[PDB]
């Protein structure tokens, strides 16, 4: 939890969409059509638009709207997209740390989402 690349801002975009942005670099989380996940500064990229979908008891899904893929953190720390809504590795807890900064913690594995400064995305405990 002491990692320096795990804090995000959540920017509302109306119509119920949000952007998930690294506080360090301003890079936005992106799910590509091929299921890979990375970071980009391209504000106009359609693949950075997310919907936060409540599951109950405070768990949420983070769904990339353009291609309907849910963010997944696997036990091995890799991050990808999936359409399998029953996967236990797509549930997140949004944990604020003050001033609009949050950690995005994947419930099943205890991993925090991380966007490294090179735009690579992974999980760290």
Three-class SS of residue 91? coil
**CB 52, CB 16: distance < 8 Å:** no
* CATH code: domain of residue 110: 2.80.10.50
Q: What's this structure's resolution in Å?
A: 1.4
Distance CA 66, CA 95 (A): 25
Residue ranges making up the domain that contains 41: 1-125
Distance CA 115, CA 4 (A): 10
Backbone angles phi, psi at 81, to 5 degrees: -110, 150
Nearest to 25 by CA among 121, 123, 125, 124: 121
Instruction: Record the tokens describing residue 2, joined without a space.
Output: 């002491």
Residue by residue, DSSP assigns 1-41 as ---TT--EEEEE-STT-EEEEETTT-PEEEE-TTSBEEEE-
Backbone angles phi, psi at 48, to 5 degrees: -100, 0
Structural domain count of the chain: 1
Count of all residues that appear for the chain in the document: 125
């Amino acid at each position: 939890k002491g990692d320096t690349h795990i804090q995000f801002q959540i920017s509302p975009e109306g119509n119920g969409e949000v952007l998930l942005k690294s506080t360090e670099t301003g890079q936005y989380l992106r799910i590509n059509p091929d299921g890979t996940v990375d970071g980009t500064r391209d504000r106009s990229d359609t693949h950075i638009q997310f919907q936060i979908s409540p599951e109950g008891n405070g768990e949420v899904l983070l769904k990339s709207t353009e291609t309907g893929q849910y963010l997944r953190i696997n036990p091995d720390g890799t991050v990808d997209g999936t359409r399998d809504r029953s996967d236990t590795h797509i549930q997140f807890q949004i944990s604020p740390e003050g001033n609009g900064e949050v950690l995005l913690k994947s419930t099943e594995t205890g991993q925090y989402l991380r966007i490294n400064p090179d735009g690579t995305v992974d999980g760290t405990r």
